[PDB]
Amino acid sequence: GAMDNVCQPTEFISRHNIEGIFTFVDHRCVATVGYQPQELLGKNIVEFCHPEDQQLLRDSFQQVVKLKGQVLSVMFRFRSKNQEWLWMRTSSFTFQNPYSDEIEYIICTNTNVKNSSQE
C-alpha cells in the first residue's frame, strides 16, 4: 500500500467519534503522517499517540467536549507511517447541532509542527 493519494499539505482534517475513532479522513493524512485515510478509519487517535501524551490527548479532548464549540489546541506526538513520533498540534472542535445541542462528531484539525525522527 502506502499511496501518496496526490501530494498533500502537512495539515489534515478528520471527523472522528468522541472516543478517538476516525470516521472520515482527508487524504492529507499521508503527507502529514504517512497514514492513509483508511488506516485511521476505525482506530483511536490515541493508538497512534505518543505513549507519554496519550492521556494528554484524552484530557484535552474531554475539555473540548466541556467547552463545546471552542477550538482547543492540544500538542502531542503523532505516530507517522514511519512509526516516528513527530510534533503535531490538534485543534479540537465539537460539531454541535444547535437544535438538540448534540455533538455528531469531533473535528481533528491536525497541524504538524516539529519533527523528531526524519533526520
UniProtKB/Swiss-Prot annotation:
Q: What region holds the PAC domain?
A: 73-116
State the superkingdom: Eukaryota
Q: Cellular location of this protein? A: Nucleus
Q: Which cysteines are joined by disulfide bonds?
A: none
* Residues of the PAS domain: 5-68
Transmembrane region positions?
Answer: none
Subunit annotation? Monomer. Homodimer only upon binding to a DNA. Efficient DNA binding requires dimerization with another bHLH protein. Interacts with TACC3. Interacts with HIF1A, EPAS1, NPAS1 and NPAS3; forms a heterodimer that binds core DNA sequence 5'-TACGTG-3' within the hypoxia response element (HRE) of target gene promoters. Forms a heterodimer with AHRR, as well as with other bHLH proteins. Interacts with NOCA7. Interacts with TACC3.
This molecule's function is given as:
Required for activity of the AHR. Upon ligand binding, AHR translocates into the nucleus, where it heterodimerizes with ARNT and induces transcription by binding to xenobiotic response elements (XRE). Not required for the ligand-binding subunit to translocate from the cytosol to the nucleus after ligand binding. The complex initiates transcription of genes involved in the regulation of a variety of biological processes, including angiogenesis, hematopoiesis, drug and lipid metabolism, cell motility and immune modulation.
What's the name of the protein? Aryl hydrocarbon receptor nuclear translocator
Tell me the organism. Homo sapiens (Human)
